[PDB]
Amino acid sequence: STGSATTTPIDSLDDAYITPVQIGTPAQTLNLDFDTGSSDLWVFSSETTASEVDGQTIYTPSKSTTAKLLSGATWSISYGDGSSSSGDVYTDTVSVGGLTVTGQAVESAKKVSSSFTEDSTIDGLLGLAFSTLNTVSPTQQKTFFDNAKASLDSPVFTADLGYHAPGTYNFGFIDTTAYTGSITYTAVSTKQGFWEWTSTGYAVGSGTFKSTSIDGIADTGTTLLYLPATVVSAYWAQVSGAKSSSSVGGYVFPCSATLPSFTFGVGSARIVIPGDYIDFGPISTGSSSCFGGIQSSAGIGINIFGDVALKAAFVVFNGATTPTLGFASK
Template sequence: MVVLLSALASLLLATDAVARPSTLGRDPRVKRGIRAPVHRYVPSNNIVSRDTGAVYHIWNGGGWILPVLIGGQQVYLNIDTGSSDLWTASTLMPEDQQKTVTRGSVYDPSNSSTSHEVEGYTYGLAYADGSGASGPVYRDTVNIGGAIVPNFAVGVCDDLQYGPGSDGTRDTAGPVGLGFGVMNSVRPNPQCTFMECLEPYVPEPIFGTAFKLNNTGYINFGYADPAAYTGSITETPVANTSSGNEGQWVNLGVRFGSGGSVFDVDPLDMDFDTGTASLSVSTDIAAAYWDLVGGADDSSGAWEYPCGTELPDLDFVFSNVTSGPSTVTIPGQNLKNGDASSGMCSTWMNVVDGRGNAGVPFYISKYIIWNQAKPTMSFADQVN
């Protein structure tokens, strides 16, 4: 999920003695990759397609989550490459706020022998959907499936807000932010992200994601798994330092097409944010794609198509490929949000102004290698 930050760039680059966790208790010479299982949270009152993994009747579609141990206490957090904080709902929040976390428990810093508050440090986030979270910063041991960072800076929420249109609940206690540290919200000095702090303990400064059609999957910390993908792999640079894209996994100037033909429309800068469900593109890109589908219509304010139609594949055409083919294709069925036999069905393609987002339709097709050192993203077809 994209974070809206108002701090000056000079603040974002500041460092001090607490900017990196202590390695006490861990030997950074012993490096190994970690594979942590994940699954997609789907509210029980929704229907999941066995063919596409689409979640019908809601627009957020759930998200991929995993159990995280903070000071030995298990909380459920979502994987979010669009933000750079690891924060959690906690017992510091009022009780009525604690009850809005619908899955698992909240973190109790007083119940951890390895927890201590960092005096004078706070975090605060405002998300694009109007929600937000803020509170003090504690250091504690964080363990994600065996990927362990001691003395990690955790945002401990004491005030949780919900945006307009929200039902006032959360599926998880918070996010594992896997953007770049320049976006971290801790003040007075930002902190390294979980993946950045994990670097001393893993073979490579990368992570790999495989989100599956059946709403399971995994994340590889510190290595890419060649058994997870098949065929050619495309590597593209990340524009995480360009103006307006600081700290994000963004690829500039992506064009779109279908069946090997490129649409005659302007390219779009694309955000690869795992905290967002829908594929978001410009009005012109959406119109060019749905012009290929007989009976497709946007008169209701969003694109719909006649149910039962076989949708054409969608090509992402990258303008600045480092290696591999420039065209990466996702199946048209990934865009379906409904599988009725008659009537009009909705889709997982949204229209936006400004930067687009790859969304779930892309992620469930590809094994993605996120390299924060180069930085690059690499895409290949998943082995399912």
């Protein structure tokens, strides 16, 4: 089997991407944030505290003839941005782009933190990291990809995120029309539960490539590119007036600037992030200070190849017995 679904930016900055997902019988379609940095499929629901729901579409398990309470199971997750959610668990039929999994754990939110309530466009998350990170207790549950894997034509999914435009998540096949050149594959460590890999270096604009190992994660659920402070300083030093602002929470730059590109290495290959992809717009409405799309990971503990980086590539998440990542230009 295969599946193919379009993923759409939630706003004009590409702060996140939503993909329609069918849950239950008859189908209830929710727009979920596909997140290769986590491993829970959770949804706003008829169980979510009413004051914490503000415009999201909810899953109502009592209206699904295929929903079954997973008795005794609870979940609770905290994300790197400080947001969180928790609740109980149903199993139900879940379909993405024509690919169907029966018996998928659908984690129903009883509580969500303010950032989720405040984002009316995201109805929940669909985790695509390794199932070892799934938070369901006392019986850990498998991701949608893990459950689908054996049925897929090939044990892969691909992320093709658009810049200020829709893109595609495919399951079970590699669309050879969706990229240019060849796909360069690179080793993955699953030891922390992430799609963790080592970039071979970077360049700023037209500058020379610096060969240096940068361990990080391919994370579709993180907006920006978080890299070591040395790398990030070298990038922003090429932008007149750019500075790190403790009050804003990162590097800012004059909105009048034209940003240089940023290149990262994948083996001997190179992925070029155009400068425009690094512009996240005014820090507050009407400001002439703009927020940078490359930020320091120093306070995180891990480097994160988020959407800023991934959207410059066609990315293969290869879930073969030994997982690997592939990157192609597009």
